Amino acid sequence: RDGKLAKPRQLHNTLWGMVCPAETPEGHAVGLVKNLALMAYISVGSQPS
């Protein structure tokens, strides 16, 4: 949490529907706990053969 800089917490533009922008906790965990948007779907994993 306490790296002096706050690079990761700032919302990067690549969270367009990947993460809900509004939902961020307030405290020592600011912008380091994010919640998924309603339609995301993390890949389960396949074999590329």
In the list 3, 22, 42, 49, the residue contacting other proteins (rule: CB under 8 A) is 22
Q: How far is CA 25 from CA 34, 39, 48, 49, in A?
A: 8, 21, 38, 42
Q: Does residue 28 touch other proteins according to CB under 8 A?
A: yes
Q: Is 33 in the site for other proteins (CB under 8 A)?
A: no
For other proteins, give the closer residue by CB, 42 or 45. Answer: 42
Binding site for other proteins (CB under 8 A): 6, 9-14, 16-17, 19-28, 30-31, 35-39
